[PDB]
């Protein structure tokens, strides 16, 4: 027994809750996650988490495992990636039941390197993972993330932009580059620090940005936000079937709490 | 170039536009068309649409084709099949490109026995079409009914319960049927004059539902309304991709036309 839904009574009615091509924008009281729970668990989902954690950034590791034991798809199953140079500053954090973790000894480059990295491991992620999530170090869980987040491909409001007009969107404005967006095209502004979606769907993402990627290179041009503008450009022309919305991408230090966000679910941490 | 969607601003506030398991519930206002027709079109999309017109039922196909061909899925391909015991009473109606019909020589029964009947046929549907939908054959196309309803398994808000809550709901009551569901259990109440999906999920649909009956006649019971009873039943534990507003099964002689309503798409004729 649940909450019937009614039709004539919106739980959300602040927020755009379904973009125009008819993807839940997702938002707290637009699902019930027992029910979500229910059908993910029937197919015995396993959810693939990626992070890189390369020099520095190995610091970030044990508070963002740690609150993702808290946090992120608990009672599922889980397989951490956490791709770094360094393996063993790896934090040895105790786990639930179902829940893994491998460690990947890899090697603007580095945060761009990611959808290289992401697409070899190619049949590894394939036969060990339903879905990949693919997120940001230098950030900690602080509330629930997880099935409700899961379709064939999925991309984050940045926190910067959700309220904003497409003109003032960062996408790369060159044509010279293949991150190129017109001023009067775009329907989101996506952050690159989360993104989604079934194994084939990223791995067909991540292999579509570095081969655009490559091709500017071999052009002698950089976008302007580097993977992030390319993952614009894809997402432009694939569009993703959920939206996250900023309660999944957050700093509270530079931009509060707002009403509008009844949940702050993955956040910045200084650095 | 189409309007920007703007996350704090809603299109419709009015009325629930998705459900708690994050399906789309479609209505006017929540989809540009143009973006899905493309997307769709990419694919090459073809929809089966499967009527039945048994005994004094044929009198209802001229209206009901003649009115799709103005509003059903213009645009992408259509492969229309009708069902019927009297294959010279189907009248010739002209087509526009892309757009086929077949006509199936068939044969509370008439109405249950449907489900049955849309499963042989189970490979030429498969091999012919991407989706399939389901429908009434006494009812007329007044306004748009297009790709934004395909997914893999939708069903529709019956007309005279969308406002109401569950115990209301006239779902089969008895433990004693295959299509029992308790009295604090149901999210909505479907119509079993418009259902589909893709080939695949309708065929597993039908053949649930048609199992299910045979279940309930060895057992001498007949469920309160039949097959649509087994649709609930259904659609409650196989819950449906996309959910269609009652825009798109109306009857506007015993409902009027309501402000909640911006388009009436699929709507009963006088009988
Ligand atoms: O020296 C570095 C720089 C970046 N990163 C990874 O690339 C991501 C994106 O970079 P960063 O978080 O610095 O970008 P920002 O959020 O400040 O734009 C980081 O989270 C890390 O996962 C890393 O591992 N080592
Ligand atoms: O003698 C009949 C009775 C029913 N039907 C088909 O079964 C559907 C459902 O029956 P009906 O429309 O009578 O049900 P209602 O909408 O009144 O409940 C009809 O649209 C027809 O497609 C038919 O072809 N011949
Ligand atoms: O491109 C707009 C930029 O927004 C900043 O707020 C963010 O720190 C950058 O990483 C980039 O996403
Ligand atoms: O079961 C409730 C009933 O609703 C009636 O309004 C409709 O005519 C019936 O066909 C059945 O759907
Ligand atoms: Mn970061
Ligand atoms: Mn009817």
Same mark, same amino acid.
């Given at each position: ?29 637009? %699902? ?5 729970? $229910? !059908?993910? #668990? ?17 610091? @970030?590791?044990?508070?963002?495992? $740690?609150? &993702? ?13 956490? @791709?770094?140079?360094?393996? &063993? ?12 973790? /491998? ?7 580095? /945060? ?41 491909? %999925? ?10 007009? +497409?003109?003032? @969107?960062?996408?790369? #404005? ?8 017109? *001023? ?18 990223? !791995? +067909?993402?991540?292999?579509?940005? =570095?081969? &655009? ?19 614009? *450009?894809?997402?432009? #022309? =694939? ?33």
């Amino acid at each position: 027994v649940y909450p019937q839904p009614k039709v004539l009574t919106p739980c959300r009615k602040d927020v755009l809750v379904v973009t125009p091509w008819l993807a839940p924008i997702v938002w707290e009281g637009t %699902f019930n996650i027992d029910i979500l729970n $229910e !059908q993910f #668990r029937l197919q015995n989902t396993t959810i693939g988490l990626t992070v890189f954690a390369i020099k520095k950034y190995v610091a @970030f590791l044990k508070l963002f495992l $740690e609150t &993702a034991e808290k946090h992120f798809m608990v009672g599922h199953r889980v397989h951490y990636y956490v @791709f770094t140079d360094q393996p &063993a500053a790896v934090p040895r954090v105790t786990l639930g039941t179902g829940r893994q973790l /491998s460690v990947l000894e890899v090697g603007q480059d580095v /945060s761009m390197r990611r959808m290289e990295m992401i697409s070899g491991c190619e049949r590894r992620f394939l036969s060990e993972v339903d879905y990949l999530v693919c997120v940001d170090v230098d950030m900690e869980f602080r509330d629930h993330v997880g099935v409700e987040i899961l379709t064939p491909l %999925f991309g984050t409001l940045h926190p910067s932009f959700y309220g904003s007009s +497409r003109e003032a @969107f960062t996408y790369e #404005r060159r044509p010279q580059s293949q991150a190129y967006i017109p *001023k009067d095209e775009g329907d989101f502004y996506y952050m690159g620090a989360f993104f989604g979606g079934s194994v084939q769907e990223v !791995q +067909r993402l991540t292999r579509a940005c =570095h081969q &655009a990627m490559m091709v500017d290179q071999a052009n002698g041009i950089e976008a302007v936000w580097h993977d992030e503008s390319h993952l614009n *450009k894809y997402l432009l #022309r =694939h569009k993703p079937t959920k939206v996250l919305s900023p309660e999944y991408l957050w700093d509270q230090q530079l931009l509060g709490w707002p009403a509008v966000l009844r949940k702050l679910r993955f956040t910045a941490v200084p650095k």
